[PDB]
Amino acid sequence: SKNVVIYADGVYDMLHLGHMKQLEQAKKLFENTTLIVGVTSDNETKLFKGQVVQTLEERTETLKHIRWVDEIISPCPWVVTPEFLEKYKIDYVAHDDDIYAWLKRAGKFKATQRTEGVSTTDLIVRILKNYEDY
Amino acid sequence: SKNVVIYADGVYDMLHLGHMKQLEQAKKLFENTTLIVGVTSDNETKLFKGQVVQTLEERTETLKHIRWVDEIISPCPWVVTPEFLEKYKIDYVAHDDDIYAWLKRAGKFKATQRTEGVSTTDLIVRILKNYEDY
């Protein structure tokens, strides 16, 4: 009935079916949703997470072609704060399984699942196992 | 005003920003469109085109998460025929630049552009040029 604002954040490097099913799940948590996707900056991703192949503009541009995405915050804060939720009228943060304890306490956390095997890197592994070792 | 049915077909292996901009272009050829995407079978793609990394189900599943896609024909005929256009009430075929001569003659061809550099394979090349030769 009423529009629920859902926020999912992530790196979204080399977007694959796995990210895509996650976003779909977030978008369909309620009947009427606005899905906001936050894309982490290049700097902070290198610092705290690890190597990132695509730039912020490339990762954000790809996400714009995904059906479930209604708005994109790019770059997005690295850490979600209660003030961030208020500034954007977010009702729920959708991620997966503690830095989410405070969101769970507030009734504002919705979990979503990773599906493995679909990775872009996994597909290269497939291309390579086309050449036996000998 | 009136809904125009647009058909784009392809392999859509390891979907990347390049396919995505193509589909976007097809979808926005007219104000009100239905974009049908045809996905080529594994058999016929190996036979006439070359190696395909992802299966038909994987390529089709990914395409379902793309905003511009309204319907998917999977698998699709390898060669487009005037009877195929009639069976699905297609007004225009959207592809790029002769096997399209007959469509151009009929006023039913709309070209769309490839954008290079965004390939999935191109991104692996980027990951590798992270290790100098020595």
From residue B63, alpha-carbon distances to A44, A72, A86, B18, B113 in Å are 31, 20, 35, 13, 18
Q: Domain total for chain B? A: 1
**Chain B residues with at least one Cβ partner in A under 8 Å:** 14, 17, 20-21, 23-24, 51, 53-54, 58, 61-62, 65-69, 118, 120, 123-124, 126-127, 130
- Kindly state the DSSP code that residue B49 receives in the 8-state scheme: T
Between chains, do B65 and A68 touch, taking CB under 8 Å as contact? Answer: yes
Q: Is A115 annotated as a binding residue?
A: yes
3-state secondary structure chain A: CCCEEEEEEECCCCCCHHHHHHHHHHHCCCCCEEEEEEEECHHHHHHHCCCCCCCHHHHHHHHCCECCCCEEEEEECCCCCHHHHHHCCCCEEEECCCCCHHHHHCCCEEECCCCCCCCHHHHHHHHHCCCCCC
Which of B65, B72, B126, B127 has the highest number of chain A CBs within 10 A, making it the mutation to test binding with A? B65
- B13 sits in the region (left: phi over 0; alpha: psi -120 to 50; else beta) called beta
Domain of A121, in residue numbers: 1-134
Q: Do the bridges between strand A4-10 and strand A33-40 make them parallel or antiparallel, or are there none, so unpaired?
A: parallel
Length of chain B measured in residues: 134
**Structural element, H or E, at residue B107:** none
Contact A66, A15 (CB under 8 A): yes
